[PDB]
């Protein structure tokens, strides 16, 4: 029944399709803001591009995190998902996987456009697409405790950022280190191995600590 | 007079109905003549060579991607003072067309700047201003969609159309000053040799006609979307057959 | 009167042949998407009204069954 | 034994002691109705019995085992309808009912949605429906479930009299085969006092 | 009665003081993100610091903008504030001025610290403090229409950013150009004059386009 | 003339025609009650009457002028209490009442909060109060206002019978001089039929 | 036994009440001994000169800045298994003390780094790790404040304390590796000349005692917040006089 | 046994005095602030309970007035 929840969340996401583009439009806003401040200089932008790309990715996923749980509290669907005959770790895993398929895949297909806007080569696009693929699920799994904790609040938009971003600091460092090594044309296999290790660890541990937070917030 | 009768939604439906075909075929004729007299039967620039043909696919796609927005203000203004709902539907009618024209302007500008600059996207003032215009179109569309009630969504869209229009000279001149400060640009948008000019003007007028056709047809789409229960649609659909 | 003397040379505009046809195709596609989307939206709204009003007729049939 | 037994439940919502020392056991095929006075706090009671809210003191018991252990068997035998219907407004009514178990085939679908009063409104989107008809999808979930335990926070809200009659008929039919329907309703209800049992959370 | 609304909004904000610091902690986390991405090199950080400062300031103010109107929707206060015998332009002006005293003055007192973490000198701190003083009111007046429309929405966290940030692009360009002209020591009076000009224009035009917008959002 | 007159009010919330063609004029000193049948849609009528909601077609008039022009004189003579009380939960009750005009000095303070039933709970924060006692602050605003026109979306929601009696006595005292109180309530109220008037938005 | 009676709220209140004074005066004596044997009656580092005394004001303020958080983990763990509300209250008791200790560590680290680096903030691994720890403390405190119900706020704080402790070694080693590349660092925090050692250990133990005193005080404050109505407070305040 | 021979030279810690005394003052102040906010909060809670219980006594006085 774990797949029925995932397929239904995909159906509700795909019904009004428009709203899933707003994370990538915000991502493109944040890509736009830095060269306006810095300048049009292509060497400085070529060096600074990992910082822009990953701060934009963190903020775009973070603002997209509201759709992960804020809908089902008001509709009452979150309660009924909690009393499904399934352990709530699996329900949380299904919601985070659907959220990655609705918020991380838009960034992964938008990846050629941002790779052409800043100026990275085809190796840079390959490493950034692979690192986005290994990192945006980790954004989902670190954001899920914060959303589960701050779904009861009316004003939970700044607080969710404050909780999530220090958790995403290690992924930030390894992702930007991977693409700093990629810009100098080095093999980035080890950095992707650490990225996959963090992905596996957070994917294992985050449903079990998001389920408890979600039980706390509803009651 | 009949201008007051231009507010009844079924009457606007048949007026748009008989202005789609003739304006559409006129658009096809004018734009076909413009491109056939521009991408051939025409010289080339001395410095840029045979890459000047892009100045067709960009410049009606640039100017009208502002012009639609300017016309949008008019509709939004009619939405705010006289409380005309159909002008607020016209805003939502023209928002995707303006967004697509802006995307075309960006894509043709990048494809033009590659054989000169060497890369697809140098942060030029023109392309950056077009990108901000695209962002404003996305904002208007997302407001029109994220709301449930269509009427109040149109009123909301009209409000941000007017906000964007008031802030639009400031953004354009601030971006032009941004390129003034850092590093200059070449003569790209409207630095045109004579006798390559009338195909461009013909393509501009053809893009105007195509935008008017697409506007006048999505207006019918939105009018059918709201009046889905009133009996005039029933009489129309029983007339269908 | 064509500037390009050969019709085969027309498709290759002086070395800068990829960019012109790239933007030509990338302008033709979104206009076709807009026209197809708008025509299909009009057809879909009309067919949705058709289904809604057939269901309204079935409501009328149910009312006639309740009356009889 | 009766399966659902409540033992010394104490709850303080925002440091207001809503009820104290309350302990009631329910045998099979009994039809308890909560008859308290305050608007909120009986809904809180229903959330404590369903396992949404942990009791601050005492415990709820299902077949002799506490609720923190027997979740995977308790949630196989319960149907909960709150004040919010628990359905998605974005999907259609048939897909919303198909999310919950079975539906699908005509043996368990398209008459369950009919006996709630939603015949002819099966494929319409939920957001284009009246609020009572939005609640009637979750109310239509009753005719397809196998859950022995039903718990209802205001089921007869914006429901016409024929609807309440049909719900009470199906609900007494459930009461016949050992099924318990714990519910809270505002309206005075048209069932004989011999069958009912009232649990009052006094003060 | 324009001042009673302003004083009451200050009392509600100051009664639970803690929340006011959450914008500046989000600001400080966003300052923390880019040294970790770019690197600890002080010349590059000194060059990029205007961009970090204004991306952080726009995002901190933007997530702070939810408290400007979202509280009064659920409490029912906003309706009664329209039904005071006062033109709702003045009510909107009082709320935005109070929000600047709640969201912008924390940044202006935090200004020495973020000047210390990015290596700017005393002139750099002076120009950035003056530029924040002339810019964050403008941030409030441009954010007020977006909050006014996206107060009725359940999902108004990404949409608000999409509306607000292209409006605030000119503030970005003139502010970061002012700090670029401050780093290489020049008189920056003209840039501050343009900042004040935009401040005066948006202060004039934003209540009149926020009052009607807030009427649309609620009816 | 009567001051408040509604002329051909038609309302379509989410493309559902709640009412159309309703037009009623109200002379001074009457206590019309909006009967209604649906739960929402009479609240929409009250919000249309206060000027929160623009009529989709037709118009509301205050003393012969449309509401889009005479806002600064209309809002000086009206008191609106919706389903939400309109007070801040963060502030204290006395300061919340002092936000609204007068209050302050003992000629207009500390008996207005007392006659609503909130004697002795003046300085407690609102968020540590029961919901009926939260609504009684806005209800206490009645004894201090100078407004001729009062419009009430469910004034009697979770107030005890003595509170309703005091509210109706103050409301009849207001009705004695020139002034209209428009209200909507579920409960059958205890005033003679001869004084009241019923304006029902029929379906 | 009496460990079960330690969860009774009045009994825990008088246990904290008689534990505050003696532990506080012991803390004052030990920390005074520590600073007064470290700031004088002690040598100074040969290279860094007399700027090494700051290593007291940093290092009990650094280690215990983690220690409190680690102790917070223990309390948060007691929150989730045995469902003891007072451990979740102890999390909120210890979070501001850890935040203030972290702020002290950051400020003294910057004051130590000025006479060497020349700038108040060179982005060293230690100060960056303490800054991230401070952000974690602010997250815990702001969750404890945002919520209305104190019990549920403490339970939410326990959840995020366990999240932060799970992800904290990852952050520390990622920051350490972040200055494995991107230049290196000197030996500053725990490279100590002997005979300049017992003052630092004495100050560490004194900061432990001060943290325990402030914990034992704010635990009483939060207990008095939560049971503001129950009659044990009534008998205590009628005993006051 | 003091490393600093002069007690006046103790206050000027070998040239590096401003940084040491700056962090000393900026360490002493926050801990003093935390101790003050831990004492004043306890006093404020106890006195707020005192006001609540005086008002509860006036509630009982009102109940006695209603009974009499």
Residue numbers in the entry:
A (entry chain B), E (entry chain b): 2 to 220
B (entry chain c), G (entry chain C): 3 to 243
C (entry chain d), H (entry chain D): 2 to 69
D (entry chain A), F (entry chain a): 1 to 203
What does the publication say?
Here we report cryo-electron microscopic structures of the heme translocation complex CcmABCD from E. coli, alone and bound to the heme chaperone CcmE. CcmABCD forms a heterooctameric complex centered around the ABC transporter CcmAB that does not by itself transport heme. Our data suggest that the complex flops a heme group from the inner to the outer leaflet at its CcmBC interfaces, driven by ATP hydrolysis at CcmA. A conserved heme-handling motif (WxWD) at the periplasmic side of CcmC rotates the heme by 90° for covalent attachment to the heme chaperone CcmE that we find interacting exclusively with the CcmB subunit.
This sample was then characterized by cryo-EM single-particle analysis, and classes representing a Ccm(ABCD)2 and a Ccm(ABCD)2E complex (see below) were refined, leading to structural models at resolutions of 3.47 Å and 3.81 Å. The ABC transporter was in a nucleotide-free, inward-open state, without direct contact between the two nucleotide-binding CcmA subunits. In all motifs, the conserved residues given in bold are involved in binding MgATP. The overall architecture of the CcmABCD complex in its nucleotide-free state thus is a C2-symmetric heterooctamer with dimensions of 100 Å × 80 Å × 60 Å. It contains a pronounced groove between the CcmB, CcmC and CcmD subunits on either side that is capped by the WxWD loop of CcmC at the periplasmic interface. For the following discussion, we designate this face of the complex the ‘front’ and the opposite side, with a rather flat CcmBC interface, its ‘back’. No bound heme was found in the structural analyses of different complexes, while heme-bound structures were obtained in the recent report on a Ccm(AB)2CD complex, but here external hemin was added prior to cryo-EM analysis.
